[PDB]
Amino acid sequence: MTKQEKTALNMARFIRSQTLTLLEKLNELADAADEQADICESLHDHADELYRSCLARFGDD
Amino acid sequence: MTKQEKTALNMARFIRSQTLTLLEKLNELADAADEQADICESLHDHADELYRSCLARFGDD
């Protein structure tokens, strides 16, 4: 892939990892952050979908 | 807010900022990352919704 695509792929990997870390933190606050943990769950799945879409488009090459 | 809520709010702010940076990068690659830029657009809006939900729940106090 190009260098510019590699930066974007690396950034998508990082965001997926940070949204998982934040989901864990919101889940640890239990009832105090319940709605927020539910939104973040969907955010993490959305981050994972973006990362896999970038890997598929820019990789194997 | 508590210290634990402040960590989660700060993390949600950071993720919102990183998803905007990644959206700009994917938009700069134009047709080469078009589907990915469309997914990331929705990701950034989702990140913004999470941050505003955390600010509303944990703030003004």
Side-chain angles (χ1 to χ4, degrees), chain A residues 9-55:
Chain A
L9 179 62
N10 280 346
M11 213 161 354
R13 189 181 295 113
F14 180 64
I15 293 168
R16 181 181 72 163
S17 59
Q18 290 286 291
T19 57
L20 189 60
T21 296
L22 179 54
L23 177 57
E24 290 175 352
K25 304 205 177 302
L26 292 171
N27 280 336
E28 288 166 1
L29 297 176
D31 308 44
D34 60 352
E35 187 180 1
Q36 291 68 38
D38 286 336
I39 296 166
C40 194
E41 185 74 48
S42 177
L43 185 67
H44 176 64
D45 292 337
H46 203 155
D48 182 54
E49 160 194 328
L50 177 60
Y51 171 64
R52 292 172 352 231
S53 182
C54 288
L55 188 62

Side-chain angles (χ1 to χ4, degrees), chain A residues 4-5 7-8 11-12 14-15 18-19 21-22 25-26 29 31-36 39-40 42-43 46-47 49-50 53-54 57-58, chain B residues 4-5 7-8 11-12 14-15 18-19 21-22 25-26 29 31-36 39-40 42-43 46-47 49-50 53-54 57-58:
Chain A
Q4 287 169 90
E5 287 167 345
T7 299
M11 213 161 354
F14 180 64
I15 293 168
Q18 290 286 291
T19 57
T21 296
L22 179 54
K25 304 205 177 302
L26 292 171
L29 297 176
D31 308 44
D34 60 352
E35 187 180 1
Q36 291 68 38
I39 296 166
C40 194
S42 177
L43 185 67
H46 203 155
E49 160 194 328
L50 177 60
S53 182
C54 288
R57 181 134 198 208
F58 307 154
Chain B
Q4 287 169 90
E5 287 167 345
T7 299
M11 213 161 354
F14 180 64
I15 293 168
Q18 290 286 291
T19 57
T21 296
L22 179 54
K25 304 205 177 302
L26 292 171
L29 297 176
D31 308 44
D34 60 352
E35 187 180 1
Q36 291 68 38
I39 296 166
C40 194
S42 177
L43 185 67
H46 203 155
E49 160 194 328
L50 177 60
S53 182
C54 288
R57 181 134 198 208
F58 307 154

